[PDB]
Amino acid sequence: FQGIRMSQILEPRSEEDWTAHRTRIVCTMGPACWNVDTLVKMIDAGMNVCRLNFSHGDHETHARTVQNIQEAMKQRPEARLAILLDTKGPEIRTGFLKDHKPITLQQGATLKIVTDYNLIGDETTIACSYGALPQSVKPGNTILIADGSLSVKVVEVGSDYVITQAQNTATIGERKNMNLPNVKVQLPVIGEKDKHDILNFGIPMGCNFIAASFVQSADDVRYIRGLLGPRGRHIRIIPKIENVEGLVNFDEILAEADGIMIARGDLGMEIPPEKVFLAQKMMIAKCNVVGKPVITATQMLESMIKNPRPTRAEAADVANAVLDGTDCVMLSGETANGEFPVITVETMARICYEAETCVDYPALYRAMCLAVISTQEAVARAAVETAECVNAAIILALTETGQTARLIAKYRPMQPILALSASESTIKHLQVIRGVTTMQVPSFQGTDHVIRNAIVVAKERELVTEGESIVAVHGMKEEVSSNLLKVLTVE
Amino acid sequence: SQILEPRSEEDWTAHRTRIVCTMGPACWNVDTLVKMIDAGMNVCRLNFSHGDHETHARTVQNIQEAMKQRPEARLAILLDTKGPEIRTGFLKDHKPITTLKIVTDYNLIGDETTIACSYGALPQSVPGNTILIADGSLSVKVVEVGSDYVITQAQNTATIGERKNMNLPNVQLPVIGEKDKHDILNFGIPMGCNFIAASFVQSADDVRYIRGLLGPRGRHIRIIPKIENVEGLVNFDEILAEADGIMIARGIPPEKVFLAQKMMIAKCNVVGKPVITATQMLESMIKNPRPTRAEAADVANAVLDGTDCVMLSGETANGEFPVITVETMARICYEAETCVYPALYRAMCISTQEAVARAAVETAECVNAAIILALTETGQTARLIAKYRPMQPILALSASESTIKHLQVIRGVTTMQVPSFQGTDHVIRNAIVVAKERELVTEGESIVAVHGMSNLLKVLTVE
Amino acid sequence: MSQILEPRSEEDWTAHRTRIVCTMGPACWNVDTLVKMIDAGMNVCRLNFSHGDHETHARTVQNIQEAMKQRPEARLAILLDTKGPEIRTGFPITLQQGATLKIVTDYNLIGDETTIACSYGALPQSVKPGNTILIADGSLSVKVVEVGSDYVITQAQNTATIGERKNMNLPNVKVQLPVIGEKDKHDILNFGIPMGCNFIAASFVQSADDVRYIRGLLGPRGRHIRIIPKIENVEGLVNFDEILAEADGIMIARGDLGMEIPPEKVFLAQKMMIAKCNVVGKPVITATQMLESMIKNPRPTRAEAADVANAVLDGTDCVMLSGETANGEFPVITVETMARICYEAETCVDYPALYRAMCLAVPPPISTQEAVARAAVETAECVNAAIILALTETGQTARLIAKYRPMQPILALSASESTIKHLQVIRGVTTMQVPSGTDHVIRNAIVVAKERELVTEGESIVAVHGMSSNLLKVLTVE
Amino acid sequence: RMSQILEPRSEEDWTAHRTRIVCTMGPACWNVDTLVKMIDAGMNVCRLNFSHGDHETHARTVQNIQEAMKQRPEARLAILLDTKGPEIRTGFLKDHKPITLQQGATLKIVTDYNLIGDETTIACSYGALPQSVKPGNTILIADGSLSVKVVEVGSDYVITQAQNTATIGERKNMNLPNVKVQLPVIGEKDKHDILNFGIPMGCNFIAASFVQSADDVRYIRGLLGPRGRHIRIIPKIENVEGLVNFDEILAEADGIMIARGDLGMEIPPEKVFLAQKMMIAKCNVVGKPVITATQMLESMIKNPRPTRAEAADVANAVLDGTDCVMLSGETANGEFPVITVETMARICYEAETCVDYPALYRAMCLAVPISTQEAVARAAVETAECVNAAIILALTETGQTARLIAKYRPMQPILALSASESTIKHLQVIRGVTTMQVPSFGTDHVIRNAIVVAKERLVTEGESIVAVHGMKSSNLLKVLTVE
């Protein structure tokens, strides 16, 4: 920065400013936002996507939640919130402790971890739910227990047990989660429960995305796609990257997927903490280059579960994800179990807006040109260039499959993108794309007509004014092709 | 390395630079005009320094006949005025010559003894005066003034050619006289001339005057000032602003004349107005079936400077090898264009129309399009695309007969006549099919289409 | 990805470019711990004059000199961090949300639930209806409703219970107290100068006049001492460019700023201040809220590691540890992991893009000496140089090179002790003190560099030497 | 720039052109006073054309050069020996009377060089003509005034058909487009000239006519040996074989002369400009001097002004990036040898104002991994722009430092300082370099003496200078501010 004055960043933003941020916001449903009234307030605040966390709840309880989303949307007929099912997936847990009493292990003390899950544990020996532990872990390996509370180094392996040594002093309760840094977990990513949730809830309840916890290989993604079948053709797959296997297989996972969710907090249980930030950056960049949405999740605004303001570090952490290039930022417990769900959504919208203040759009556009072509991409690229060249107020992306909108968004134009589509599922899928807002349009509508309608609607809503330039892009037969770019003036 | 590759006819006939040929007794007959079409002629120049309306009408009707044998061709016709010229006549065997008599009778085939003068009032405009001939190379002193002749003594030992300029100190002629006015009004308009090339233009007033003379009856005629003197060079900016294009002739040291050609071409380029380099290109080919190295290099540097058109004068008008000359001009242009494409686009660097024309040229490159289609009614879309010098052919589609003739002067564009079909997408579909039937595109190939006004760029692939 | 997942050796993370400031305290100030801290990455020792007496900081200094005996190649800089202006409440009371609280200028008044005393006598002059007043580390927030000549009436925004004589903050407001009080004056003149402190980190700097006053205070006897204003409030931020122009360098105090500014704007303020320090080549220190959890835990959190790395990616010269080293259970481990995070962070710095960005960002005209520094950076790149040598008396040559952020280590050779120590805050620089012609100074530095494995036979070196005229030399190691 | 076309270039201006001018010696600039005037006009190199004259005759010329330099002690002229090399000629004709061939006429060409020729038949001096050529080959006669197409080949004759109408005389030159001439590039005559004149007479360059192979360069260098170490070889590229083998020829060479007139007799005229541009750019990239030669200002043999076309051709060579431009008949055999050098210098000055210098350095970095010495040279050019320096000083013993700076084409003058007299001579061929001979010694001392003279003749107190030094091994670059 030079010639730009410090007092500039100290202007308060108006509702009109921060609600027009480009980054998309994902909110986890829960008791704190159980009722229709707060869901509506969350829409106004910036909510674009509703996450159903299937680690808890059942088909009945999540049905009530869905019914409430549908009611909120009746009060806001212009909002087309997407619904994301987030699977439970594989889990490793410690077993039970004598008298349910927590145990404290001392640094350098010996802990046996056994495979018999009936074993009632004590300070010296505990049970682990993962039967293949002794055949997964080797001497020198690290095992984390209770959200990384306790760290043990593996000293010896038997057939049905492992001898470990505490790396720190800690107090652990019973049935705590376990992590196996640098070790593949030999458990199905999509178990029978997950399969039931995808097929018997996700499909008939109108979920638009599946976020699949703990994806370890691209075969996991191919598996969900075949599971989804023709009846689930309108559902997009968002693998969650949570360990080393996910990281090591990232490129093949990304290629098979419709987008990525980066679970930082889980990744920090599986690799040195000082490397998670590198991984995030790398994974966002790779998603960007290929034009697929990336969600940044976990450890976002966690203090707001209890406080009406986030910490400095938290605001910075969210802002840097935006600057890394993230499509979405995600709230978890802050909205599910928080004292300030709507205030948390407004706050993240504000942090997004301020980070987007930092974005160099010419240098992002040219960075994508040096990193990446087809007819569709060339025209999307020409559109962004031309929009900038003629000082256009907005870019119209006319789109059936979403491709056209995504290709333009990929180039991070300074101008807002209005994606126009007759397809309901496409409009929903687009709620996950930075820089895009959405308008559903009737079927069998001519190109010019659709463009005419969008501009006059925009002019009535005081988004564009008489005389400003507009850039419209029409991808035709998007994934089977012919591509248009029109420049027109608001009358 | 691939410098030494001989050129197939398919290759060099695809040259982008336009070729203007001067009509003359050596080439005006239907049979040789057809062979000239085949070799690369795009524009026919009628030089009104010579001959009458009857002569020039015969030339025009022959052009029409030639076009009936080559229906796909759309030769433009340029009228080049006489203007205030005072030039020497033709010499024996077209050979340059090394006590001299200058005559008013321009039928004289001159020699060392006596030469002719294009200015019929030369005797009344000079018994002791001085006359400079061939840009001040020969200087003569008038000994005697007769009725229709002058006797001079060569006050300098020098060698002079034919059709060379003559200055007369202590003697002023209008840019457009009554004879020029008559030619423009009574031939230019009724004979279907598309261009007026106005000799010795000196200011933008000259341009506006011709535009005033042309009026509504000549609205379809475009004006090309010739910059031939210092005044026209001094007023070039104003002249270009009013003009439709520019013609650079020879007629400040030569150490500085080379700067003038570069400056004037570059300025025409920037503004997308066509420029014709008409600077005595391949003069040896009046007598020889082959150019010299220096002549070939002279044309090539014109093309590299960015000229839209190169022009043949005596080489086609009074030459022994008119068809072969056009051919070797097509061949030179092609080699020069060979080393001319991402450089000119980034070196050219606005309105919506130009923003889209520029975007279309970039997409074409990016997508590796076979051709760029320029849907145009006034020619402007085609011109705006062309000024970006794309690597791919520009095919211009127009319902406007006169627009299609004006376009013959634009480097990089071929034309195709399209019915006034109120539908852009229909016109593109229809035109692609004829491009196939011309083998300019094949199935699978990419095309970029442009229409200006609502400005449009469309990328499709040929079925 | 797995290039990212390469488990780093001690040899790797010990070569990090970013400098590390550690705060001295009872947890670390013993000779043996200080030694382990040098090996871990510590480059600068901060003496926090907010606490302790001249005796405590003197023995600390003495312990640092002894540690340097165990490490002769190490040259630690010492930074005196001032107490500076303070506001304090008078003489524990709970007040619930919405309750009226009076704050008075009569400091001899013993307080209660309704009326409390303030040490800041010009409080009415500074504050107005609307302003917020923070008490006891921002634990209580009150809003001013009306102002009298010797009192202020406020409304509590949260329920809190406050103790006796706690701090106060005045968001968005200039505090009219001397930035260097008589106490700070004594600390600078009667400790800073005689104990050989190299930097003064001046707390709560609010204007360019504060910086000029300090340098005037230092005078010719403190010529060798550089001034690092601390940016801790809105007044400091608003006055940033004029403060920076007078300053030798800048310390960013995020936590403090977080008291006066919405959290969602502090990150912006950090970015901008670092960027401005870079473009002008003056060192910047990122302080507070670094690896705070490591006061009690042997490992940092994911979010803490990320926060540190982002400071590095923003362009910070130094990162600074506070309570982590001064009072923590793992002072040595904290430095090592700080060093480790810096290494990972510098692992994704685009050095061609940083040099290009800087070359386009810097305003003209650039000087002879800045032109040669640029040239050395580009030459180093074309030639695939292993290191850049900077022969410098004042430190300018080294600083100008470092601001262009070369891939290669910069080894700065100087005969000036103060210069060697000032360079400890400069990202990418390593120092070697020398006594006094270019030739055998260069030859000897190559020997040491070769043995340190920074260069091997047949590789190229770039040596730069300012003195006014500038030299740039490329040689082959032999 | 319209005012650049109008305002007349003042004396001091054109005198400072960057391009080097090579002048051919002969009767028209025979005497010392004319050569002295040519020095003032901008002559940098004197070419001796060994196609004519002998060792006595060319020795007189050198004496007159040595003497002209005594009147201009600051001038250091390079002398260049241009070999005759191999030649092909027609034979004699009945009654010595020239013959006129009509287009389409058949002409037999025989190998018996004793045959007195006819309208119907002539001899050729090249005995291997029929084995060199086949049906379809073109043969050019008398500077290409007559072209004939080969129709039939025998053991000792070829049958041809004229492609045009021409009249030709006796003993006229002949060219064989796209055919290797199997005659020594360095014959016994050429070897004698190189060893027995070139070396002992102090020539600085050999321009080898008609180089077809890199072996020709190696042969010449073998010839010169230890005794001719100080002599640099400039192959002349004149036919298809020189073009095919150009990269190899340039790799061995110290520089290149482009003989355009000759090339236009060997390849289509419309391909010569390509060849010229290509050859200059390649020389530029690798930092070796290139001379553009023949058909430069020919009309000035008889006229006090050149043609529009000629001027533009010289200018475009300068813009192509030529280091030197050469005059032949214009100074050897013309009426205006001084005026020709002069107008050549002014043409060079004017074309160099069109040069986009920052674009040249940018294009040079992308085209040319690169060494330590070239890195410091490039860093000097960049720093000079950056700092707005008056001059670049290049301290050099072999010339290498000066040549590496000059290939980056800085906007500022390069003042090269050397203790080596022959290096100073070699540098007469490098664009943008001026030369000062220095005593045989510290290097910070030589710079002070060069700043205390530039003040007299360039820089003024307070201006920035960039100095550069090599070891051609370490390299240095100083930026200092004039006293």
Author numbering:
A (entry chain C): 36 to 407, 411 to 518, 521 to 531
B (entry chain B): 42 to 139, 145 to 172, 174 to 218, 221 to 300, 306 to 394, 396 to 404, 411 to 514, 522 to 531
C (entry chain A): 41 to 131, 137 to 481, 484 to 514, 521 to 531
D (entry chain D): 40 to 407, 410 to 482, 484 to 499, 501 to 515, 521 to 531
Excerpt from the publication:
During glycolysis, pyruvate kinase (PK) catalyzes the irreversible phosphorylation of ADP at the expense of phosphoenolpyruvate (PEP), yielding pyruvate and ATP. Previous characterization of cytoplasmic T. gondii pyruvate kinase (TgPK1), using either parasite extracts or a recombinant purified enzyme, indicated that this enzyme was allosterically activated by glucose 6-phosphate (G6P), which enhanced its activity under PEP unsaturated conditions. We solved the structure of two different constructs of TgPK1: the full-length enzyme (Met1 to Glu531 plus its N-terminal 6×His tag), which crystallized in the absence of substrates, effectors or added ions (“full TgPK1”); and an N-terminal truncated version starting at position Ile39 (“truncated TgPK1”).
This large structural rearrangement involving a rigid body motion of the B domain resulted in a maximum displacement of nearly 20 Å. Finally, a disordered region was exclusively associated with the closing of the AB cleft in the truncated TgPK1, the Gly300 to Ile306 loop.
